Design a protein around this ligand. Structure first.
Ligand code: CL
Ligand code: CL
Lengths: 275, 279
């Protein structure tokens, strides 16, 4: 099975018709979402249970971990230890964990997170922090993908059962990772498309925040990306896909375009109308 | 003849429905009530030169801005994210704030550091690096780690600020059992002072609590507390030319009232913008 999803469930009016949509409404169209809620602050267990209750049996969640864990944030800010930060996170996510609706905890690392002895150790630290949970590592630094590291890194990922996210980001003259279809964990793969707005990037441009995921994958690009998704589904059990190119609002459209190209069905929630 | 002057302000201008009446308030509407405001817009991302100019154009001649610097500069963020060098990140920031600087409506660039930013040789170096970056501009430094305020550092530190013309922010935060900074009313820069009242919600603090995000600035100063804070400001205004005060205790919406409550106590006036009955 191949699950196509989007980041955020409320901001996809193409998918649902309404400007702000509910998770229930969302899960009447796709069987997958990424949620970056916890990234900015670990939510209460009760609200995580609201999400679980709002979706089908077949539905899955890509849950982005707290920035304190992926190192953009600081554990010190609200927690007395790195250990207690994880404890807080896992206690918050228990409802999602126990429900079997977790696709994987996404651990997106900064662009500055490069291939060093420390960082490799930290990746092992994360393995230990998330006992036997599905962890998806998104590297955004081509240093890991250099000829002298690639093969040993991929091996590292396999050993630690890490599902290395397959990333399609704009190939800016910095350190963007390549679109490298490869299954590190056969039990689950994760694609993440951020658009290819290479043109539109300027050095020292603050608006790159908005432009970096402003893209409408054309009919050709979707065909090529689909072929990759399909090729990894041969080598993997679960295969997740998250379209993140939504600065223009194109995410939902491009995802359903791929659904057609991959020819996929649905057993989601259902519609109604009253209030 | 210029007299030393006091300004009471708040963080952001829109959500203060108390002193405006409207749920969302404009900067113009805000600037018909108080002479000062802090804006944290740049902290999350450096805005365009154009929008900064709009702010300047929407306020009186004697209105002042406390402009919180980009997170990449105070180190909560990474300069790498959008810039080719620490240097170009500063160029980008100062080109953006060009209108605000040239208007003479800038009170100070606020540089708030993390709680993890304690007293270190490397940290002191970065402060001097900041001094360089901001040439001859007003810089208010807010430290949030008591390591700087220990007996073996505090005095040496205060001199460091004086010598680098830094206006060390007088902080008033919840005195949690962690590394909170004490209320230390002291003028490091006689040309400008800056208070920042974050509240005193020590009770309500839980270790490993994520909701401390909202609880930490959730407080309503009582008349006794306002009087105590007022006396502090009155003391510093005698030693300083310009004194700023930013009420940041607005998780419950109380900042506005507490600020105006202090205004009555300090007994202050205004000749800023003017209200209107149209929209
Ligand atoms: Cl991103
Ligand atoms: Cl704060």
């Amino acid at each position: 099975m191949i699950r196509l999803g989007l980041t955020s469930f409320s901001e996809h009016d193409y998918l649902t018709g309404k400007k702000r949509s509910t998770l229930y409404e969302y899960a009447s169209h796709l069987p997958l979402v990424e949620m970056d809620t916890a990234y900015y602050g670990i939510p209460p267990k009760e609200r995580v249970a609201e999400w679980v209750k709002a979706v089908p049996e077949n539905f899955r969640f890509v849950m982005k971990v707290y920035s304190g864990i992926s190192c953009q944030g600081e554990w010190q800010t609200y927690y007395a230890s790195e250990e207690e930060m994880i404890t807080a996170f896992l206690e918050s996510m228990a409802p999602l964990i126990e429900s079997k609706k977790l696709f994987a905890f996404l651990v997106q690392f900064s662009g500055t997170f490069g291939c060093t002895k420390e960082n490799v150790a930290y990746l092992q630290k994360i393995r230990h922090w998330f006992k036997d949970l599905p962890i998806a590592i998104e590297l955004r630094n081509n240093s890991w993908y250099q000829p002298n590291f690639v093969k040993q890194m991929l091996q590292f990922m396999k050993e630690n059962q890490f599902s290395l996210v397959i990333v399609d980001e704009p190939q800016i003259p910095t350190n963007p990772v390549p679109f490298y279809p490869y299954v590190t964990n056969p039990n689950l793969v994760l694609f993440r498309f951020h658009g290819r707005n290479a043109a539109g990037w300027l050095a020292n441009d603050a608006e790159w925040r908005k432009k970096r995921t402003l893209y409408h994958y054309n009919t050709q690009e979707i065909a090529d990306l689909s072929e990759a998704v399909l090729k990894m589904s041969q080598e993997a059990k679960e295969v997740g896909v998250i379209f993140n190119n939504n600065s223009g609002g194109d995410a939902a459209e491009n995802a359903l375009q791929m659904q057609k190209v991959l020819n996929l069905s649905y057993d989601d929630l259902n519609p109604k109308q009253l209030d």
